[PDB]
Symmetry: C3
Subunit: 288 residues, 3 copies
């Protein structure tokens, strides 16, 4: 009879963090809610990440959510959380596993890149969002810089981070709506999969400037994007048809993750053609 | 001339015993009280009775079922009485008696072990109509599940009829838009229901069940599947249909009109007579008592 | 550096009679004001005047109509006056005069014959461009009907244009998402049900939804999303046209298509590739006429 649906709660440590870590000044990632500093476990040398919040309702929420989320091996692990006094104020100090193999597009950006790595990547991010949605959490800021590789070792796991914007989203014949209203917060995660998938396939976003920005906003609202050659020349209608169903402008039209995750292109990611893509070249050139 | 005028409800105040012997045979137990066997004094016939305590939910129910009962696929209301029962005001609903049994029974003891794909379409079309009449007069039934689907008799050509309006609600220029005419998401649920029923109907078990905070997650997520053996003869078209009914976002679900114009439904008598496992699996589990 | 700035609306206050002979022959007639023919005294030319009474609503009409005016598929405001009429303050909108006829009128000025499916495609592409222009600057027209779609002249290359902004309303690298940048109700998607209605008519010559006298019939048939493609009329309209109609006449506002999708549709986009197939539309239009009655 089911057990390991039982995992430990979060005990918030109250001792000062510097008992346990050396807080260096290296910013790993500026991020939301403050910054993200690299720190070091004192009694094992090992490497970790700190993000600091002034304590409040919002912050207790970030911590509650990210904690529930750490279960999933594609969300970045919360190792420890401290309540400490800093400069007179209460703080939550969030100690994360340190992921240091780079940002998704950063890694891609320096090497060839195939449709198949695209799909594999997209399966991964796909699992992180399936897990959030199944325990009723919407992330709400899935973006390139929140998608990080663990090491620089070429099978690094990719992991989703930053719960600064996350919200709880809340008879065998009862319909989903009858088990209580979901707003529509859960489908921006899906738009996001869309935008990432697009970038992965070609090196640039479906919607950008021209500095052209009242024009970008229209283009977004209007859902005007396209699949220009050369980059999209060898990309199958199947793949294009998927992005179109994520980038729908009407949120109640997009696919759910369950539908995403069942798509033959994600489900059998390891069977997709290894078709060579521009992603990495477009990525060196378009740095600017 | 005018053939679309049907008559209003005229509640009798006369005590129901003037006309009916009220037996004690329980017949059904959903929502409010219970439905009993009763007999027409002057003619001897078999009829059903629902005990409602007057109050505002009761008056709604009678009102909607009366509008509903025009349809040949919805249990007919023969008379509504307003009587006084142990001092309390009471609405007593005399329905036609449907003694053929619930859908899944008549299906489980199908003697001739031969439930075909086609019979499934014929049933589904008939559940269709009931939902279509309902929706076309702005009622959402809101409790469409198999125990509310009963056969009139045991006759080989008995009709299927929907019952129980304990939860029914009203959902309230040639070019105007549906939105502009005036209606919340209050009626896609009937349309989910149908998906669940077709699912069971084609294979014998529900697409969603206990392992149950699980099952609730599974529903909320739309996690179901068409396992073999049972679904292996079932064509991609027919489970596209299910897919669009089981859509979790209510605005993406299909609507009865789309459903009723699906060719699998529209042209029943020309869907193949492929054997299904329904009747075996329904028989296998007296688990359906929960 | 590029700068695509077009000017603002300067409401003139000088009495309009200074500028225009004002006749009384009525070109048309709106909810909120009938449309009169006028002549410019200097150039001697032919214009249309719509008379409004000053208020928030009137000023909102004018400001939207002026913005939309930039689009070559919309009837263009040429001038706006604020004058005193019968001791009432008034908004006098001057517009280009279009005397080509309403869309369906022009269609039944032919016996000849052959209104073909490609021509229909072209016509929808033209109404579609008016809706894309509007919608891309966050206006919803909201009364897109056969009777507000006017040809410029009876000449052979008259332009189809949309008019009447008396019901219109406004609204409100990067990864944000259409919602997460300002809300926005569904006033837009009804413009889109209208293209479907107009498309339906165009393809066979009678509406998808009518009162049989059965107008509670019709109200119902509309909420149901209940119509069909009868033969003989639809017998050789391709399936894809019917499916485009289906996307447009979805009863769920959020299910319907967007003009961006509409305009990217192959039957709209690659017009020159749609069959030249004859169509019962002019005949039916002509047979019917009881439209007035
Ligand atoms: N929860 C949260 N909220 C907000 C922000 C945030 N950023 C963040 C960023 C990096 C990063 C980026 C990078 C780039 C190169 C090398 C190491 C690198 O490390 C991280 N590595 N490990 C954890 C971690 C967390 N995380
Ligand atoms: N309106 C309403 N509200 C609530 C409940 C409800 N149940 C109900 C049930 C049966 C039934 C069930 C059954 C089972 C076996 C044989 C004959 C059987 O008959 C009925 N037969 N006729 C009318 C009728 C109405 N009906
Ligand atoms: N802005 C606005 N608001 C409300 C209404 C409205 N109707 C309208 C109508 C006609 C028309 C119709 C017609 C039919 C035949 C011949 C000439 C014809 O001219 C017009 N011609 N030119 C401008 C113009 C504006 N316009």
């Amino acid at each position: 009879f089911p057990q390991f649906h039982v995992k430990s709660g979060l005990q918030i440590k109250k001792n000062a963090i510097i008992d346990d870590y050396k807080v260096t000044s290296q910013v790993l990632g500026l991020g939301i809610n403050g910054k993200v500093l690299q720190i070091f476990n004192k009694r094992t040398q090992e490497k970790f990440a700190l993000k600091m919040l002034q304590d409040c309702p919002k912050a207790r929420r970030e911590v509650e959510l990210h904690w529930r989320a750490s279960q999933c091996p594609h969300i970045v692990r919360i190792v420890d959380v401290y309540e400490n006094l800093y400069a007179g104020r209460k703080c939550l100090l969030i100690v994360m596993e340190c992921l240091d193999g780079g940002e998704l597009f950063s890694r891609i950006q320096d090497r060839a890149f195939t449709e198949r790595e695209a799909s594999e990547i997209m399966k991964s991010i796909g699992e992180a969002i399936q897990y959030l949605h199944s325990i009723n959490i919407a992330h709400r800021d899935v973006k390139p810089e929140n998608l990080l590789y663990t090491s620089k070792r070429p099978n690094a796991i990719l992991k989703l981070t930053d719960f600064g914007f996350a919200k709880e989203t809340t008879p065998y014949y009862v319909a989903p709506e009858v088990l209580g209203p979901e707003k529509y917060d859960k489908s921006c995660d899906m738009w996001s999969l869309g935008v990432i998938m697009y970038i992965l396939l070609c090196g640039y976003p479906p919607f950008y400037s021209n500095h052209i920005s009242p024009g970008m906003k229209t283009r977004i609202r209007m859902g005007q994007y396209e699949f220009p050659n050369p980059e999209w020349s060898e990309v199958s209608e199947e793949v294009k048809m998927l992005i179109r169903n994520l980038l729908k402008t009407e949120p109640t039209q997009r696919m759910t993750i369950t539908e995403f995750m069942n798509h033959p292109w994600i489900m059998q990611s390891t069977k997709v053609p290894q078709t060579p893509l521009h992603t990495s070249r477009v990525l060196k050139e378009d740095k600017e």
